[PDB]
């Protein structure tokens, strides 16, 4: 089956150099594998995001030559799907309602103890937690090798729907990547630790687990003007050939050659650069 990858930005700001790295690396790996590359706007909580940011992000991708396949998926148009997934989990004996306060959880060290797991509380003024069976605590990264996660965090009956009504990231990412047919997730190293919880969720749904690559995080908005020197800097960051005389080429030519020359093994394995 065809490779399917994606870039899934949060519209809490515009793209910066760090998010360009994630977009570019996901794009290059997808195109090198003769695959599809999709874009999903994570506008799951629009009251806490910035009007106009999603549109800015899509325009920036186009400016840097990173054109996606198909239609953009919007998480603001997917709450029906998340609700459906929650209903299935509850019906299948895989979730429960938790009425514990923030203060209680804080007092026991910040990781839930499964207090409400067999209390059979109703949905009224409650969070929804997953009822883990066999938590995943390690995974394979195609760049970094085998990763060992924080065991206490990995084994928690984690929140999948918040008491304030927000759908949890870990729920929505699995439901949407599955819906879009994603076969490999190429993203930043800041998402390493939640990976094992997401894999646990794929297993509870009975769904095929994708492959994972976590790129190094670039640490301290993209220029509106000439994108070429910024693209060259991003290619260098990712350990790729970085054309000296970029002034003689278009963005499109630079990307076409970067796809031809893409070497995953040359990407740095540091968590942060
Ligand atoms: Zn509870």
Swiss-Prot record:
Gene Ontology CC terms, in alphabetical order: cytosol
One function term, GO molecular function aspect: zinc ion binding
EC assignment: 6.1.1.-
Cofactor mode of binding and number, as noted: Binds 1 zinc ion per subunit.
Keyword match Metal-binding: yes
Pfam families from the UniProt entry: tRNA-synt_1c
NCBIfam families named in the record: PRK05710.1-1, PRK05710.1-3, queuosine_YadB
Name of the molecule in the record: Glutamyl-Q tRNA(Asp) synthetase
Classification lineage: Bacteria, Pseudomonadati, Pseudomonadota, Gammaproteobacteria, Enterobacterales
